[PDB]
Design a protein around this nucleic acid. Structure first.
Ligand SMILES: [Mg+2]
Ligand SMILES: [Mg+2]
Ligand SMILES: [Mg+2]
Ligand SMILES: [Mg+2]
Ligand SMILES: [Mg+2]
Ligand SMILES: [Mg+2]
Ligand SMILES: [Mg+2]
Ligand SMILES: [Mg+2]
Ligand SMILES: [Mg+2]
Ligand SMILES: [Mg+2]
Ligand SMILES: [Mg+2]
Ligand SMILES: [Mg+2]
Ligand SMILES: [Mg+2]
Ligand SMILES: [Mg+2]
Ligand SMILES: [Mg+2]
Ligand SMILES: [Mg+2]
Ligand SMILES: [Mg+2]
Ligand SMILES: [Mg+2]
Ligand SMILES: [Mg+2]
Ligand SMILES: [Mg+2]
Ligand SMILES: [Mg+2]
Ligand SMILES: [Mg+2]
Ligand SMILES: [Mg+2]
Ligand SMILES: [Mg+2]
Ligand SMILES: [Mg+2]
Ligand SMILES: [Mg+2]
Ligand SMILES: [Mg+2]
Ligand SMILES: [Mg+2]
Ligand SMILES: [Mg+2]
Lengths: 197, 61, 106, 146, 172, 127
RNA sequence: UUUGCUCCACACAAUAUAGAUGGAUACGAAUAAGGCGUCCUUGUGGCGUCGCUGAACCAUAGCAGGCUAGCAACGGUGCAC
RNA sequence: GCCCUGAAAAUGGAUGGCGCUCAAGCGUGUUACCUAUACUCUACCGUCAGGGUUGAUAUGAUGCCCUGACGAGUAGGCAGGCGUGGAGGUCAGUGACGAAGCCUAGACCGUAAGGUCGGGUCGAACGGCCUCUAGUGCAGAUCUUGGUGGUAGUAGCAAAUA
RNA sequence: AGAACUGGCGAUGCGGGAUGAACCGAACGUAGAGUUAAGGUGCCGGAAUACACGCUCAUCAGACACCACAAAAGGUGUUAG
RNA sequence: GGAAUACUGCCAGCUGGGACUGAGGACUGCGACGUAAGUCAAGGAUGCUGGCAUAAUGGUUAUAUGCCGCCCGUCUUGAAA
RNA sequence: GAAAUUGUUGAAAGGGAAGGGCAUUUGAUCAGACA
């Protein structure tokens, strides 16, 4: 519906979120993913770390600069899983990937926008209670990501600014709701109540 | 997919017209073709079929 | 008012296809707001127009239209099958189409 | 099994033919059991098959049963003079069942409209497939294919 | 193998001149439809008496309906099944409202826990436990406690649209 | 101005070109049947060129018919042009390529009087 | 290298669209738990209320939206400072 | 029953890939849905079989017309057609007011073999139809003769004192 | 390596098994519509992130015939008897 | 003791929406509705209306996009090798 | 005065080949009837 959909990556499963996003891109929808360092993967930390080390040892024998590239950033990790679900070698596939943006945290162009969630890919709604899961931000640092502290420092600053905005908005909503309740019990309100509004 | 019980597009195996190019012989075939069609007499059908035979199949009498 | 829309928004998904063979004669159309094969029976027979722009002007206009109609439904998710006089180009996979309310049965 | 199918005039898939149940015909059905699905037809199934897909073999030609004149011209000597008399000789096996049944060209059915109802056809109906003796359940299958 | 119905099948040997009017044999069969029930009748009769379909006939087949379909009952079932090596006997208890709805639970449990298909399971007897404390399986006795009461934490709600505009809650 | 006919249907408008005629200059585009043992075109693999066959034959009602609805009959002078005086709704005269410029003027003038259509009336026309 | 280069407003020509057709409507955290309102001794506090989907909220009437008269409020909204 | 130990090979690595953990895994059950040159119905092409029709004054009885079914293919067989050099007959055929040849992401006819037309170049002979005849159709044979490329302005143009 | 019966490949495309002369479905004139086979319905990929009862957590899980392999012997891991 | 409903089956019961097709070309046949004359959905589509009359439809050609497509000839059970 | 091959002018496309089949978008070009 919206021209651009902004998805908050916190508390999502990497595989199920990527499948949802990949289908949206091929249908002409634009998707923006924020806070990629808060993504979740089912399974304990040691299992996913061992799998990544297996991926690390796959490279071209005669020249390491031609083989697979092992990106470490959480945004790039999600991009790799998403690119595997899209036929990126075709002109149609390249067009779909041009509609995708992945970020760590919430950069200033999208901090004052509305973020949505995908109930299909939510970890809390999918994994059975008591199961193990891995946070993508912690895993990336273990394999060579070097910007976990700066993201945390800037993200803490963003929450302070956003909390102040919410306090002002909450007060304004309280004032409007009080006026709306006062305006009730009138003839216009009764007529609207008869028609469901 | 059809499980044929016999050969397909098989010709009858009998002569329908004379092999020769004799104009007078073809006139007799045209005459007896009409008779064999509008007289239902077994003699006419026999004579019409016998006009198609080859030389070895028409020994002298 | 500020809205003059008399059609339902739609998207061109792809041609009718197998795993490795496609048929351009039939195009799959996704209609916004429909998620049930039963809800898609309303839009059967409705006219579909694909509107695009061109640099050259022919009949006093630089806008060209390809017409079509809805024939049947497709799958369990409300997708329908549409056929056009000329098949839609493959580059329009994901482009917006207009589904009008005529012929009307209301 | 191939020769028995030809003797029952089943040369293409989804073809049908009525068979009179005797001791000799039961042994034929056992041989071609994996390849056919058969059962016990009802009056409604027989009537709809003849009206919609009824074709006669007249002078080695497939002639649609569109009028009672052709039935009279080819089955008059056996006492049959109408399409319902032809149906009557089928539902009730009469003395002239062989001539009436052989007159009808083998039925050419399509695939069932609702499907076969099973993931794999080539298993016995008892085990969950398609072929075998499904008795009165054949009426539901034939109507879908007709 | 499908939704189950209970059929009473009564069979008999073909009468002869030496012994006219032979004995009648009856047995309850759980089957998807009428065709399977008659086939299963000959399968079990060939394991008990010198008779088969060719030399026998089916006298009558009737469907059995539950007298009280809407009353919760405790059922004890005895089964004989074949594993990958050898044959084993087994007794299990199922709590449900009807025999047909309790046999289907048994076939699901046998396939899930023992990998036993329909073809390798024999239903020896299905009986209803009438008195409490005759239940000897703890997974059934726990539902027989006076004033049973338990909540349903962590409710998950299905979503009809791809995107949601608020963080969901699992309250119930 | 010809006899009414049903709409003409072309089953295969595309030309049947010889395999690998675009790969080598020594191979002409005139159709030739592939007869190799391992030939993919002969074995009819998916994604290869289609071959001529009797199924592509055109309807006998509209066979040999030009888009205008007339049959093409070559003419060389006045005498053979007059053979179409009673069949102006079925045949259209066409002047042969080797007819001189001055003789084409005579043929065109004669055809106008008889009402016979000419498919190439602008050949060697000194305008 | 014949008054070139650059920013601004529109005058006219050409160019192309991976695809406007009312509005991308902003806390954070938890989920075997929370949002909002209210009171106090300001707490891991007391009480009330809400959820069970955005099926919402805002916006939306007039020649794709003209020309005029009057009434009640001193509001709502567009553009340039 | 499932899972784990038993369980060690060499370029980097493959449940087809991504990825999936009340599965998108394993056992089993019920529905809905997707799509083959297969099946049902219609049109058209061809083949085969069985039939109708000689009555002039309008043209093919090898003609016209009705009915039904059928169509995969190497080695190989038969049939109907297209094209080339030359020969007898015919069209009292085309032509220096331009024959033949060649060029032509120009047009038309045929399922195809091919035919015809427009435009350009060109300069002296050539074609349709019924028949006769053969040194009669090329993509290959490390084929024959002749001509031309990429390599490539590359290897190289450094013995014998200057 | 050598025999018996039948069906196939060779001589054969088409849908499926990613990929393959033989396996599964099914054999073919040129087109249109409908319904299916074998195999499938998270994304690549056309089709339910369908419904239902259980089991399994592997620091080398498992994932579909031909077919691209694993055993004897063990575990107070867990489930049922 | 008296009903209802589920499940399965039948109707030569009625009725709404969508898609593809229009083959044939004087009459002849089998029927239906009518006292009749006639009519009809009965051996294959007609009636009404609009715009344009040209590159607008369409053809050819170049390019772009989706899916598919391994190098021919030959010997061979088997050749893209 | 043909083809292989080559120069100039004009048009077009080009991210480790090019060429091909089905369908359509775009550019250029073209025949047919106006009864
Ligand atoms: Mg592509
Ligand atoms: Mg580094
Ligand atoms: Mg369907
Ligand atoms: Mg199946
Ligand atoms: Mg052509
Ligand atoms: Mg071969
Ligand atoms: Mg399952
Ligand atoms: Mg088909
Ligand atoms: Mg065929
Ligand atoms: Mg053939
Ligand atoms: Mg050229
Ligand atoms: Mg010349
Ligand atoms: Mg000279
Ligand atoms: Mg020679
Ligand atoms: Mg040569
Ligand atoms: Mg050769
Ligand atoms: Mg050579
Ligand atoms: Mg040489
Ligand atoms: Mg040098
Ligand atoms: Mg040197
Ligand atoms: Mg061989
Ligand atoms: Mg495999
Ligand atoms: Mg899909
Ligand atoms: Mg066009
Ligand atoms: Mg292409
Ligand atoms: Mg490919
Ligand atoms: Mg060898
Ligand atoms: Mg080879
Ligand atoms: Mg040249």
């Amino acid at each position: 519906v919206e021209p651009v959909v902004v998805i908050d990556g916190k508390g999502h499963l990497v595989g199920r979120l990527a499948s949802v996003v990949a289908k949206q891109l091929l249908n002409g929808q634009k998707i923006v993913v924020v806070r990629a360092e808060e993504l979740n993967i089912s399974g304990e930390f040691f299992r996913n770390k061992l799998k990544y080390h297996d991926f690390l040892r796959k490279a071209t024998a005669f020249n390491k600069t031609r083989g697979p590239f092992h990106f470490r950033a959480p945004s790039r990790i999600f991009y790799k899983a998403l690119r595997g679900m899209v036929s990126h070698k075709t002109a149609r596939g390249k067009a779909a990937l041009e509609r995708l943006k992945v970020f760590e945290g919430i950069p200033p162009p999208y901090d004052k926008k509305k973020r949505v969630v995908v109930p299909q890919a939510l970890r809390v709604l999918r994994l059975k209670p008591g199961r193990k899961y891995t946070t993508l931000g912690k895993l990336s640092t273990s394999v060579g990501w070097k910007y976990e502290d700066v993201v945390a420092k800037l993200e803490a600053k963003r929450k302070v600014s956003s909390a102040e905005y919410y306090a002002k908005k909450r007060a304004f909503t309280k004032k409007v709701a009080s006026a709306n309740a006062t305006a009730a019990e009138s003839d216009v309100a009764k007529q609207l109540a008869a028609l469901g509004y | 997919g059809i499980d044929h019980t016999s050969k397909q597009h098989k010709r009858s195996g009998h002569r329908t017209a004379p092999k020769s190019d004799n104009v007078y012989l073809k006139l007799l075939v045209k005459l007896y073709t009409f008779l064999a069609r509008r007289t239902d007499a077994p003699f006419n059908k026999v004579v019409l079929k016998a006009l198609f035979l080859s030389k070895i199949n028409r020994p002298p009498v | 008012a500020e809205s003059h829309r008399l059609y339902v928004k739609g998207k061109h998904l792809s041609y009718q296809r197998s795993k490795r063979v496609n048929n351009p004669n039939v195009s799959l159309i996704k209609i916004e707001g429909v998620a049930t094969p039963q809800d898609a029976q309303f839009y059967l027979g409705k006219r579909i127009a694909y509107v695009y722009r061109a640099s050259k002007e022919v009949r006093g206009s630089k806008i060209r239209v390809m017409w079509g109609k809805v024939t049947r439904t497709h799958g369990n998710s409300g997708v329908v099958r549409a056929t056009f006089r000329n098949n839609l180009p493959a580059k329009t996979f994901g482009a917006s189409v207009r589904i009008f309310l005529y012929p009307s049965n209301i | 099994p191939r020769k028995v199918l030809q003797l029952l005039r089943l040369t293409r898939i989804n073809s049908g033919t009525f068979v009179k149940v005797t001791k000799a015909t039961l042994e034929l059905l056992k041989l071609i059991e994996p390849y056919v699905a058969y059962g016990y037809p009802s009056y409604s199934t027989i009537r709809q098959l003849v009206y919609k897909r009824g074709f006669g073999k007249i002078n080695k030609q497939r002639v649609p049963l569109s009028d009672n004149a052709i039935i009279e011209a080819n089955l008059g000597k056996y006492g049959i003079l109408s399409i319902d008399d032809l149906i009557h000789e089928i539902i009730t096996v009469g003395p002239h069942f062989k001539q009436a049944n052989n007159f009808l060209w083998p039925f050419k059915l399509s695939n069932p409209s609702g499907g076969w109802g099973v993931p794999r056809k080539f298993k016995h109906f008892i085990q969950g497939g398609s072929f075998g003796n499904r008795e009165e359940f054949i009426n539901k299958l034939v109507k879908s294919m007709n | 193998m499908a939704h189950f119905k209970e059929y009473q099948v009564i069979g008999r040997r073909l009468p002869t001149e030496s012994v006219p009017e032979p004995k009648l044999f009856r047995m309850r069969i759980f089957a998807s439809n009428e065709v399977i029930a008659k086939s299963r009748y000959w399968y079990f009769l060939q394991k008990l008496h010198k008779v088969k379909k060719a030399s026998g006939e089916i006298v009558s087949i009737n469907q059995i309906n539950e007298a009280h379909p809407t009353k919760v009952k405790n059922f004890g079932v005895w089964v004989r099944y074949d594993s990958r090596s050898g044959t084993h006997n087994m007794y299990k208890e199922i709590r449900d409202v009807s025999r047909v709805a309790a046999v289907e639970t048994l076939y699901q449990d046998m396939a899930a826990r023992h990998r036993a298909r329909f073809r390798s399971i024999h239903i020896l007897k299905v009986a209803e436990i009438e008195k409490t404390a005759d239940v000897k399986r703890q997974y059934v006795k726990q539902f027989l406690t006076k004033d049973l009461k338990f909540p349903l934490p962590h409710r998950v709600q299905k979503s009809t649209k791809t995107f949601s505009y608020k963080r969901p809650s699992t309250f119930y | 101005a010809s006899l009414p006919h049903p709409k003409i249907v072309k089953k295969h408008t595309k030309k049947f070109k010889r395999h690998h005629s675009d790969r080598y200059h020594r191979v002409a585009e005139n159709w030739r049947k592939q007869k190799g043992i391992d030939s993919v075109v002969r074995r009819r693999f998916r994604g290869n060129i289609s071959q001529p066959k009797i199924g592509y034959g055109s309807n006998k009602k509209t066979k040999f018919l030009s888009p205008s609805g007339h049959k093409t009959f070559l003419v060389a002078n006045v005498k053979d042009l007059e053979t179409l005086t009673m069949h102006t709704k079925t045949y259209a005269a066409e002047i042969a390529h080797n007819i001189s410029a001055k003789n084409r003027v005579v043929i065109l003038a004669r055809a106008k009087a008889l009402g016979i259509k000419v498919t190439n009336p602008k050949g060697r026309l000194a305008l």
